[PDB]
Amino acid sequence: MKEFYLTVEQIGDSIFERYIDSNGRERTREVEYKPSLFAHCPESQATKYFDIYGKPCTRKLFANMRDASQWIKRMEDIGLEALGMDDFKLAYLSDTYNYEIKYDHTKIRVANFDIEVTSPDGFPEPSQAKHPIDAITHYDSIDDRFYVFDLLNSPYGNVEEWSIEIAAKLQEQGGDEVPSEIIDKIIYMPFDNEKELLMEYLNFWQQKTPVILTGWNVESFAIPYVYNRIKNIFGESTAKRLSPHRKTRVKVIENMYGSREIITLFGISVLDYIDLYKKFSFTNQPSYSLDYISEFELNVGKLKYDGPISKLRESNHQRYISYNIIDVYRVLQIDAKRQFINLSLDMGYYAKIQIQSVFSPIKTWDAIIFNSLKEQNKVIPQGRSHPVQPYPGAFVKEPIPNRYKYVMSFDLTSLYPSIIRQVNISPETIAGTFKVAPLHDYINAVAERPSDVYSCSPNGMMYYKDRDGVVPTEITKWVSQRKEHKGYMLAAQRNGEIIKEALHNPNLSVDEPLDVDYRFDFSDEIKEKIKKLSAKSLNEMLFRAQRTEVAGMTAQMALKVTCNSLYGALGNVWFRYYDLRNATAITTFGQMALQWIERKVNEYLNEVCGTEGEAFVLYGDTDSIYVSADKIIDKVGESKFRDTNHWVDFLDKFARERMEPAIDRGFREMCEYMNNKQHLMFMDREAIAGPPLGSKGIGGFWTGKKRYALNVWDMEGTRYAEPKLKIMGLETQKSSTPKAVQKALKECIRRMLQEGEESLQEYFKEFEKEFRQLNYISIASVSSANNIAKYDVGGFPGPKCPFHIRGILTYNRAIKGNIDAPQVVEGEKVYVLPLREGNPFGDKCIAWPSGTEITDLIKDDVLHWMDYTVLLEKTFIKPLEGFTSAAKLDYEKKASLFDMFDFSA
Template sequence: MFETQQGYIVSRHSGDENGRLSIHYYVKTDKATVKVTIANPETLFFTNAPVEAIATDVHGVDCEPSQLKTFSHDEVTVVRCQSLLLQQQMVAMVKKLGFTVYEEDVKPEDRYLMERHIRGKVTFIGQPDASGQSFSEARLKVGEYEPAWQVWSLDIETSVTRNELLSIGITSGDRKVVLVVSPEQTDLENVYTFADERKLLMAFIKFVRKHSPDIIIGWNVIGFDLMFLDQRFKTLGIKPALGVQGETWRVREAKESGKVFANIAGRVVLDGITMLKVGGYHFNSYSLNNVSQELLDDSKLLAGGDRWQEIERMHREELANFVAYNLQDCVLVEQIFAKLQLIELQQTRVDLTGIPLSQTGGSVASFENLYLPRLHRKGWVAPAWSDDKFVPSPGGFVMNSVPGLYKNVLVFDFKSLYPSIIRTFYVDPLARVVGQALSQEEGVVPGYRGASFQRQFAILPELVAELAHSREQAKQDGNDILSYAIKIIMNSFYGVLGSSVCRFYHAELASSITMRGHELLGRSKQWMEERGAKVIYGDTDSLFITLSDELSEEQAWEAGKQLCAVVNQCLSEWCGDYADIESHLELEFETLYTRFYMPTIRGQEEGSKKRYAGLSGGELIFKGLEAARSDWTPLAKRFQVELFEHLFFDKDLNHYVSSFVADLLEGRYDSELVYTKQLTRPLSKYTKTQPPHVRAARMIDDQRAQQGLPPEYDRGRKRVQYVYTLSGVSPFLDQQALDSLDYQHYIDKQILPIAEGVFQMLNLEVTDILTPQFNLL
């Protein structure tokens, strides 16, 4: 007897079983997460080969003409196969015959959902087994289910000296559990001790199977925690049966990128660092300690590069403190996810685009999920992968700045510029190939690099319009998560069309977006200057202008609003005259800097780009300057902020700088002299140059080798802390590293570069202030 249920797709899978394709999904329902296997599944691809050229009597393969066409206007045949193996063989045969294949790489489990417009919420009908945990012969359609996720925050502790697992901590709301290797029993609440790793790992498997989390979160949880657990499972010969129905998980590392992936049937693993970046959050350091301090005003119970020694000591001698340390990391991650609504953001991305719940990136997948069904409905198949040479499109508009100190700087931004260009000028893969093929000019909108777009065939403008409308509605409803998720999707379209990893890539597409942006910024600049404004800088979608210094703040705001309205009217009229199109371009005026500093390129008279400081609404704002960068010391950031407070509020700069340097020489800022920089690749890859942070990392690993410890930085992708002492670069491991600091270095490299640009604009000589201090060294 068949049953109908509502649920949410947690994970999706396909593979050949007994010579037949199996497509199955793990779906969270109110009762449990169940396995749903699709009835009569098939996998398919398209080809420009005629049916008679590839006709075969092989059982399980069906070829028939299709109503679809290729971008080359060829008719296509659809080849349906009952197994992945058969599809691989048919694809190879078609290619050998000299024909082209299309969409052969679309996974059958993704195509099944895509063609039915299913994202995450689903209604399924299927035949349950006796346990009610599996459904066969199932069919799926769009549903309305809202899941209540069971989320676990997971963190492990390990022995660096023995490369062994010490404990696994788990928190989920009020539940806090630690499984720990310990020779003794304990009366600590919810702490379970085990004689060795094997027994702990076996208990962990049982615990996961019993309580069945939907989503596991953590900090570098895939790249470290799961990777380490997987290695211990393999070493001890244990099958990691952590899937919903006891399936083995798969944790693998990509050879080229070094990125680690985890696949667990019916469960999803989300990494906190990755989710922060998906959410558009930026931190000087993405360490758990730093992020929790900034977001939660809380921190780990231990921090620093040598904390492993204290962890091992607490494990031996102070089990209660060790457990507290393990659980604190879990709690911090849980609180960060909750505060920033990172799981809600991820689910919203799934609901909008249909990407798998576990896929934190996936701009190309998002685009194809949205575009392919629309393309098929219009009668076309996606283009085949091309070996054509990649031609990068021009970057965003960036004009040379006019350096100086200003009052009343107004900033105008185009709202969602690139999506608006797509919508206004009909930039679209299908519209391009149709416009190229048709000779008539009616309905054609010119692009760049020879492109033209036939507006009646454009898909993307309609898609962008739908998303833009949904975003406005989300804003009205106060749904910030939905609004931001839509923004991410719309802004990704340009990057996808300009990326060689997208099958729809063509140089004319991305160029018709960026070069149109250049034109629009240039025209807007002209219209503003014709009305008395002076444009001092432009960047991608923004223009910075100055009006009279004599205007009050209120007058400047009113002048900015009027100028914005005029330019928007000019844009609308120009679009009509240009190609009889409706403008969806919208210039906004939202920022007024009452004081503003645009620097020169260091050591030159030419104005810099993407670097400035301003005072807006009483708040100091830095862009690209030392105070906004992670590779300068806290000292430099403090100095720059305080320097510009003195500059913008007309305080005595000379006295401030000389006093600051005097305090530096007296050691009052020693704790702020630590550099922190990220290793972008393994240490062994730094062969041509040896930057300071690389030398510091090598020193640390050399010391560890002498102690018989494994290297800490051999894999790279970690931040290194170091200082400059009188003997040169030195790793910052503890306070002893501050005993012989090279103050001259910090004056020359951290203070002088910040001060000299400002003093030069004021016709002052900063070295006159600093020279007496030099003599004290």
């Protein structure tokens, strides 16, 4: 009923807009938008417009956008500030939609497609589009259909029609295993020549023009190829037809290495899912191929084919088309799980930006703050250029490398946004400065009180207490939204453990899963039904609860990063509200806050245990403290606990009823000390970690900063059915560590924390024996391939050449001259294996594209010359040496006087 935009675009003096109207139909505008900009004026000229500092401004209405834009630059030639929203697209959206936008996703045309191109030359470069497009699968969210465009005849072979009957059948019948739930949604259309296929695709494109266009590498491959191929056959004008406003532009992306070209389609928002994944998944992956991510996300994988992909359409055209359809579907399957598109939509409409601007936190916040200031008749300052300057960040405590038996951790909730709100940090709320004492003096409360009238930060900054800042006001809206979605997420997590516990002792019956909302804790009535439920329907409930959890994670993690990005933007020279005073004010307050409460926790627990000077806090990073619970348990005596859950319950109550109130009054005192606007430093308990009761097992260990492992029984309110390992920083968490090595090192840790030294020594022995029999990919290292050309000296390694780069140059020599094997792509990742000396390849290592097997033309030699000893030492033994040294254990039993006896019975 209320109308909303789809895409907005500026072309010359006109604004081009696609939108849904009051009746719910998609329409297009061409508006000659008249933009306003502002200039400072004297006190006499009474207006309603004021800048953020309170100074008056006069309004300048322009005849067109060209006039407004060129008024800005000649204001600089005089040397005067040109105020207001210079991005006229954002100005238009704000005027046209001066209310909270409530959109309808069912009316937004979201499309994802993928292309197939047969190429014997090697990789088909989008910039050249030298080879025919032989397949296109295009999914439309409004129709809910997969549109398949098949080429029967090309210079690379004539093929028969694709059979949907064969596609549906299982591999064991000679079928393709195309998921049954999409079979009835496939609209198939074969073509005699490329020109007919490409011409009908454009007609289809006009009839159903995408608003959000997505897919896997659509921006870097699919879109450019379809654009350039149409251009080369039909002409530039016909290629422009992919744009609703017939306007396209080649955009050049250049970073600290090389450059690449993409194609901007005006009037369409392109959200490449590979980029949504990298931004919002919070995972670093060894490979970013669709087959690899699909396997990680959905535990599926694809049916394997014989021969190279360049010969696939020839040998097996049936599978060729089927795989293309499947690939278009898995993006949708990943989105069903992660929900990054819905996230992007909610975010973009809230900020009132082009949907693709979700990739730019600076644009996002610049729009949010502008809209907030516009409501109050206030005028935003001009964007000014600044030199890049370093500034201090968080505090990280230097831990003593040791094992730690009983550990309990605490985190500050939304630290940086909370500091902003507590101290009232904002551009227009700066009051002044005070003489700053050493940071240590504020921590112990020995320094004099900074101000009696203003809200202070230990970096020397003072802020107004009565005035509410734009930044604190707009951040408040976001943090309360995170509290809700994290609440849903944690309840889904808690509900998951109840079900996991029910899978241990199930009841074999024929029933269905219970219809419940997993975002809320199960009631007693639902719990008793779960106990009498079948393992089949329990596994379905578990799948659904975890899927609800993942949906909760996505939402809360995105709000987390967007809020932290506001702090981050303050330290970025391009942000309209760039201010290192405000940036440092935040980080210095945090530094004091962490170290302050460390002192308080140490004081409290010493009084509680009847001792003095004992160091209870062992570690901290930014907003967290890790407390040694050894003494707390010892004061009671661990003989008084009947099982593991007993002492976990005890520390839980100790934290909630004793430590947290003591923490609250500590921070409350600090609030008075800094004279802050409001007390918002709240600390929740996170981990309760320790060994199983009665077992050998070290519970946890630290090796250094950002590197530790814990055996966690309870995390932030969720009581695990089985203890989960919390490992931070260690090699098991790095995408560069081989897959099999990660798994082995994790088991090493698990045995250390839960079972003890003798168990570790046992597993080491067995892994060391069966090491050589592991899949070569699973034991291969991963690294990013940057600056290959920089170290390439006539095919051979130059000075200071990194290990993985040495591998690539070896690979390139091995595949040199032969028509085309898989090529290593600049900027992407590679597998790395060490080679034994004397190998037919030039060097001590080899590298090839990750997520793939090496060429069969070189595979057997690599396997034969693999250096297993160097690989075991570098990737497995050396890291395990690190863990065991820290924990004061041996992974290998040291020589003893006992060796001079015979213990074999």
